[PDB]
Design a protein around this ligand. Structure first.
Ligand SMILES: Nc1ncnc2c1ncn2[C@@H]1O[C@H](COP(=O)(O)OC(=O)[C@@H](N)Cc2c[nH]c3ccccc23)[C@@H](O)[C@H]1O
Ligand SMILES: Nc1ncnc2c1ncn2[C@@H]1O[C@H](COP(=O)(O)OC(=O)[C@@H](N)Cc2c[nH]c3ccccc23)[C@@H](O)[C@H]1O
Ligand SMILES: [Mg+2]
Ligand SMILES: [Mg+2]
Ligand SMILES: [Mg+2]
Lengths: 446, 388
């Protein structure tokens, strides 16, 4: 009865947490909160103490949705053909190894970063001592990013280290203002807090410019000019086809794709690239962002600029299964970078979908299915040793390793990952975030 | 019959029915009581445009005067789409009036040069559109605006030099749907996304915290927008969105159109060179355009002119005199004599030429004194001679 009241508060609290992360209105959030407050006040009177969460007593891929009915997840090979991108083959990976002299990142080795556009052109430029730069971004939809968001940022940090190039990181607080029910100050504050998470991945302050759109649009001699250029060469019909917008949407949403396109061109950042328009751009992202840059690549030559190159990642799946991606707006979907060791353990054991059989004795006989097991999927992203991953795959598949064992292994990887990130995030002072976010000349001459 | 920012058209030779237009647009007619209130507030004789019903319609001008009489601040906002260096005397109508408003009320002024607009609509580069904004700014400065109280700005330049302007553009963009701009401006889904979002950029200068070096974080300062009535749809949209984003509605003063040379059925516009008397025209070119091309309301043949009489309601040369002939009594005498048949078109047109020649010549002389340093200073974000 009192335990049943506790669980109802935990369920409703998680629902309230998910609503704040998604595109719900403040009035919808307030209504959910009023239920939560009502249950907690009933618990306080019944239990004689406050509630604390610790103590019981056809595949669709676009920027906003990843959905499939398959338990195995998105058919990434079919997605390449549909989007018209190029498969990252062994020959391209070997070329990156030759050019950098570094072991290919595990995401490349395991086909996590699996698709590209014009990556050979980036390597042509690099091998001929011509400059290029990295561009990625974050829509600061709430405070606290999740482990899924580490996939593009870890890879971008690796690319920056091995190629030694400047990086621009777009914080689209204007996007989030347009799509969510937020004030401008709330959207900007989420961008600053999310920048601290991004900085905690270990990007070099001498080589990295992280910018708020709301701030940078008002202080740049090139950025708005490029936005206007891009806006002339994209129609509403085109963005309706690409992004699924309708005439009931606000004009800000309709025009926003040009703002995400604009950082692809070097003269958007005149203080970094000495007013030059010919610096190759490379854009690491998960493949859901590709519609923005398919559009950007079509526009590029019409305004006299080179097309940006792409590197596309797979999706870090939701805890409930590979049917959806990990998303802050879905209940019990995410492992956040603010989660404690307890909460990481709890989420993996309670919520991570198992491909193992229902009983232990059945598991010994028939074995597990790694193609649907979420815990094994997470190990493909974060277990560093390739031989250990394969050993775990074989043993789980044969039945020699149980679900409990597989989850213990994962928890021992995710706990230090998130803890070390938190340790680095605490070192990020207000002075450091400001410096990362101040328009300035980076340590590169052009 | 049809009036929007891109076209003014009517089958009538008398021109636009301005009284019916007030009713359709939902604006307010300027009456003598309002003109008297402006006189008492300023302590100056009302401008000939007000006296003769050229500036004829308004929105919330009583609220502007309420604020002004109670010693509250207001500011002026107008603009120019720099399509080319080729401006004409019809463009002087809003800027001459705005300059008078600045003097008599003693208020700050912002002038928007929409080079981004003309890039989006016309076959121009960014630098070409910007260059026209600079050249047009010299023509605007030549009307005599006070450098200590006037901020002229390129959208392309100023968007990147403002902690306030883009933030307001985004606020407006969030609260205006595509269905609304389709309904207001007649845009279609084949239009570029820049055209669809542009009305937010023309809306943004209506709100004072767009200009932080002039007004800081103040969101309460009354705005007043002089224009010809073709711009009204932009500010119908602005007035509707304002309360939805916690800002006051901008007030308006609407002018009539300086008609085309060939007739009042169309307004004077640079897009058709034959309709326009340009500000770059010489004395000789002003004679030729008035004599040969300015439509006559008089009868063909001299005998019929004295028998039947002239028609001031369709005569373009008389219409131009109502805008620029300074004496009211002489205008009425010319109206009487032309209507009765005493004055012929030739005599009417000759009197018009004697007003337009020194009008344009003096403007050309004042424009020549506008240096590169003055236009630069006008266009630099800075604090004006006002405290808030
Ligand atoms: N479950 C997941 N697994 C793997 N990757 C994921 C997962 N969820 C999100 N991502 C990727 O993380 C980045 C940020 O996502 P956003 O939705 O904030 O992303 C956004 O809202 C953009 N509008 C911000 C942006 C601006 N410019 C860019 C350039 C590249 C990438 C992103 C941007 C993205 O790379 C996204 O693909
Ligand atoms: N034949 C005529 N007779 C009398 N007045 C006329 C005639 N033709 C034009 N006007 C007025 O001149 C100003 C500039 O016109 P634009 O078409 O450049 O105007 C434009 O292209 C705007 N998008 C620029 C703008 C931005 N903000 C503003 C605020 C007020 C007025 C104008 C603006 C206008 O006042 C216009 O009403
Ligand atoms: Mg997001
Ligand atoms: Mg998103
Ligand atoms: Mg006009």
């Amino acid at each position: 009865s009192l335990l049943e009241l506790f669980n109802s508060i935990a369920t409703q609290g998680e629902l309230v947490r998910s609503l704040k992360a998604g595109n719900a209105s403040k009035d919808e959030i307030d209504s959910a909160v009023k239920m939560l407050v009502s249950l907690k006040m009933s618990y306080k009177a019944a239990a004689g103490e406050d509630y604390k969460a610790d103590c019981p007593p056809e595949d669709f891929v676009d920027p906003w949705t990843v959905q499939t009915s398959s338990a195995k997840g998105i058919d990434y090979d079919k997605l390449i053909v549909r989007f018209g991108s190029s498969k990252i083959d062994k020959e391209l990976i070997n070329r990156i190894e030759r050019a950098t002299g570094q072991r290919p990142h595990r995401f490349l080795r395991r086909g996590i970063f699996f698709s590209h556009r014009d990556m050979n052109q980036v390597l042509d430029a690099y091998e001929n001592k011509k400059p290029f730069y990295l561009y990625t971004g974050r829509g600061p939809s709430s405070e606290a990013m999740h482990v899924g968001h580490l996939i593009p940022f870890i890879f971008t940090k690796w690319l920056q280290d091995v190629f030694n190039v400047p990086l621009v990181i777009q914080m689209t607080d204007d996007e989030k203002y347009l799509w969510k029910d937020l004030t401008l100050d709330q959207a900007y504050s989420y961008a600053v807090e999310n920048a601290k998470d991004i900085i905690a991945c270990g990007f070099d302050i001498n080589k990295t410019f992280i910018f708020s759109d709301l701030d940078y649009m008002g202080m740049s001699s090139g950025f708005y000019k490029n936005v206007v250029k891009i806006q002339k060469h994209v129609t509403f019909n085109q963005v309706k086809g690409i992004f699924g917008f309708t005439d009931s949407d606000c004009i800000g949403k309709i025009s926003f794709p040009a703002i995400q396109a604009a950082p692809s061109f070097s003269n958007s950042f005149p203080q970094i690239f000495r007013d030059r328009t010919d610096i190759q751009c490379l854009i690491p992202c998960a493949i859901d962002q590709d519609p923005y840059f398919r559009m950007t690549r079509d526009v590029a030559p019409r305004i006299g600029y080179p097309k940006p190159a792409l590197l596309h990642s797979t999706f870090f799946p939701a805890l409930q299964g590979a049917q959806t991606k990990m998303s802050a707006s879905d209940p019990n979907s995410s492992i956040f970078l603010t989660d404690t060791a307890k909460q990481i353990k709890t989420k993996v054991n309670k919520h991570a979908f198992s491909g193992g059989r229902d009983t232990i004795e059945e598991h010994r006989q028939f074995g597990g299915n790694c193609d649907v097991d979420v815990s094994f999927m997470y190990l493909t992203f974060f277990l560093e040793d390739d031989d250990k991953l394969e050993q775990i795959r074989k043993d789980y598949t044969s039945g020699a390793m149980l679900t409990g064992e597989l989850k213990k292994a994962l928890i021992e990887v995710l706990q230090p990952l998130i803890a070390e990130h938190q340790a680095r995030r605490k070192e990020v002072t207000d002075e450091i975030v400001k410096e990362f976010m101040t328009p300035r000349k980076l340590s590169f001459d052009f």
